[model samples]
Target: STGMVMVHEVPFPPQIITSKPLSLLGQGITDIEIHFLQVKFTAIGVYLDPSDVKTHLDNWKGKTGKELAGDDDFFDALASAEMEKVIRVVVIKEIKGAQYGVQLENTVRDRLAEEDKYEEEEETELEKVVGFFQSKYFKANSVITYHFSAKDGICEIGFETEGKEEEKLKVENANVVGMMQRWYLSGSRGVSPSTIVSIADSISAVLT
Candidate 1:
């Protein structure tokens, strides 16, 4: 049973609160594949009570895309708020060599390492623009007709995250959640010097 892999749903942290679940398909937080070796990603989220998504929709209630684009007060709101409780995250499952499932067990060590480095150094206005708002579960249904219908794909999740961030998010287009995300290229990004958070198996297993 050493290499048995499963699709696990990552949940929000305890200290960090949130509202009812959200998923593009109106289900809930997304899930990730573990022990798969080929791909590895997980999502951690926190709730912003009353909800940023609620406020975002409220702010743009009657306005069209063009109208809101020219709205000064709306832009001001975005700049001043935390936008959402969720913070965009990245875990580099790309470290070359025999990680085997070592990356799965020592994920925080590797992920925290990634938080310190971006794809590469860069300087640009748009890159500057994309640094903003931040912030899953599951099983069995993992195998179904055609495919196991999860909540949303990375692109859908990434896109809606920005839509709800109300400009607090800094990605060029939500539809693009590929390796070439704009936020990673946005100047400098970092994780805590001592913080290492992950979908841990236990309190001791977690690092934060």
Candidate 2:
């Protein structure tokens, strides 16, 4: 049997791209409210190398998953960890790619601006990421993978859908990359609440 976790009936594998052997630390869905109705857009899997987790989160050795899940400090620590990470996103509801791209640009830009990191260099890199998604359609089950490199803070994004060649985009700005990582790894403020819980549980186990 495959070692995968099911999120909303969609299976996410334990490991993903690159040579890092990244483990699936969490799984959840990204949902939005439209006209007062809840709509799920994607099933998300967050992965990180365990060795990195052990090194970065060593100070939290005694914390429980329940404690970590409720603590923003724990997540902040995770966000700042120096390691490769993978965000595997599987579409649940079809939507225009431009819409998704715009959402990403807004969030990433705003977050960077909040910290005074949204300079001209960061803006240029973010535009490339948005432009990369502008011409495509995000259909159900389409897969979008974000690979955050451990060194140089590069984020390489890959998109794959049925009956189409995979597309790739690279975001080279460290500031933009940091915001993107925080977008999903920010505990209570993360894109998916359940994912934060899953991540906390996984880390808690490793800490013991």
Candidate 3:
């Protein structure tokens, strides 16, 4: 008697950008979404080795899990097979950023036909705003405080606006907070759990 085996591939959709800052005040706010895929295999009627697959999965999971769940001897058995074969996995992530910063509708449209032109102009404008804030507000402020958080791959960054209503408004309108959130969220995608944890840790250290 002969048997047939069938395999199926799974497809994951790319993360979508949901919303953008609607007004100047919204520029200081940002929202990000991250999506990930995980895979596992089960053999039917036949004994198959899962060590290598499990190991790679663990590596992908990184430090996300509280403890290691796989063992070495089991992996060795899989490796010892002359023609050992097992399930393989590939993980993919999609990251999207919703930015709320100052935007010149006209400037954006003028360069729509030329990507390079748009990029250059956008960079120049961003630099100018960043420079202005650093010189006028950041440099003079002594007790400025920031707060940040990350969970399930999403991150948020906020500034403490105590007595400086004007300064807070300036920061928010400049879209600095949203930009920072996009940066951290993008950097953590497809990374090990440990790496993601470290990213959160770094943000907490700087903000708190």
Candidate 4:
């Protein structure tokens, strides 16, 4: 008869130094003290099941089997089966430091200036484009709301149809907290990092 398993212990560094300052505003702080320490790491694991793969493949075949060849079906089934055995792990390590604060301040200042210039250019171009499209497709008195913002190295332009309660709810539900969880799990696609920040800005503007 089998019993419970016992795991062994291991010893490692208590903390890891991920960041340190080279200097502080022309002062020699590098010699005075270290500027950063990381004490914890977080991880998440995703597991897949074979039964789930079989179900998904069966559904896909039923939906689109008419377009697939026998070889295609075989390859897809094999791929799906392998996908079920895969385990996805995400590791997040905490990095702490004062040097990061100084660096971030400088970066924000520089990016804000660049973002201002980009927004100016975008505003002019966007107006022309919107005007041209409206002339061709839209009529007068058609309600449109424009939300614009510049921050953290990006300029965002968004449009929402007036009186769209459901759409507004969808945006609210999907922004910020929801999106962060999604990104932490599935990550982002095609969208630039700055665009994510800009989307948060647009959602806040609309919700408030």
Candidate 5:
């Protein structure tokens, strides 16, 4: 069994990261089934499922999954030291979607800044041609990750974990964007762009 629970929505992580696994309970999820039991990792730091952590990474994570696949050194270094062994849960709360595609261009610039490692540009004197397909911005194409933080790591990442450090949970994936992306089209050529924003408003309320 690949043990994959392909669902459109999931209960927040705690409900799933139990001693064994969680079962399909009730209406918290819909349209698809649910399951549990979560991140693939590394020696330096456990490589959390980035989609699970995409809020931290921000808007363009999905379009560049291949690039993130190459880079594994991004999480808190202490997490690599022993967070996995320490056994923590990287829970996400308030997962929603937004019209963030407009920012994708600067998003690319910020990422490239770290790699090509640019010196602060006084000004290019010329437009850097820093933009993406207008089609990308045309949609409300983004994941809304209002709050996400890991708990019970070996050391503090300066956030609260709701104080359940002793719990040793395995891993799981959050496919909010994956969920949002599927909503991209209504039937064929395009989707009701109107539906996107209102749906986000409803989803955003799930957050505390």
Candidate 6:
């Protein structure tokens, strides 16, 4: 009903600012349909500058959005682009932050370990990120923002909930940051298929 896009009745801005302004290129909800019931956890939006994407991904210029969405190489190129990206997640249902942290840790840690990049140093950094969310509760409308700066090889996690000052954490581990980015942007394997498709469409528009 407004300029913002709605997900499960939650509105999100078409653009968001982190270390830099980023256009909201992709959006969707994290959900599962179990037999007769559909459950939603969070609404996710991926933001990046289209020009920056075009600069790095010009090799795939002739491809369609569906093609790019099906290609892991395109997602790899997108993740490795040297630009700032912001991934915003809004809670659609109440959940314990501890459970949320564990889900993230499990996904990222396993991937890192599979790639032979999960060292003790990486674990320490992941622990810090998990600890940052350990004491909070994710109520509906609560927002968690991951601002990744490729130039700095760092990610800043921001949390905002009702009646509280925003809380923040900095994760300086590049591997951890990369995995977190991939978790949401890894083409067909991404957390949200709709978001991946939307991001592919956005980049295709910039390319052509």
Which candidate number has the best TM-score?
6
Candidate 3 C-alpha lDDT tens digits along 27-101: 011112435534222111111223323432333333222122123222222223222221111111211111112
Candidates' C-alpha lDDT: 0.26, 0.87, 0.26, 0.25, 0.24, 0.88
Number of colliding residue pairs in model 5: 4
Which candidate order results from sorting by lDDT in descending order?
Answer: 6, 2, 1, 3, 4, 5
User: Against the true structure, candidate 6 has what lDDT?
Assistant: 0.88
**Candidate topping lDDT:** 6
Candidate 1 local lDDT, 1-208, one digit each (tens): 2231121343223333233433211012222446864343333232233344345435445444344434435433432343333333322232222231232223323332365522322213223323221111112121100011112212212322212322222333212321222122111111111111111111111111
Q: Score every model by TM-score.
A: 0.24, 0.93, 0.23, 0.18, 0.19, 0.94
- In model 6, pairs of residues that clash are none
CA displacement after TM-score superposition, residue 23 of candidate 5 (Å): 12
Poorest 10 consecutive residues of model 3 by lDDT?
A: 20-29
lDDT of 5 by residue, 83-133 (tens): 111111122222111222223224334433545533334112101211112
Clashing residue pairs for model 2: none
Instruction: Judging by TM-score, tell me the better candidate of 2 and 6.
Output: 6
Residue pairs with clashing backbones, model 4:
none
Distance from true location, Cα of 73 in model 6, Å: 1.0
What are the RMSD figures for all models against the true structure? 18.0, 1.7, 22.5, 22.6, 19.3, 1.8
lDDT of 4 at 26: 8
Clash pairs (backbone) in predicted model 5: 38-171, 38-172, 45-80, 96-144
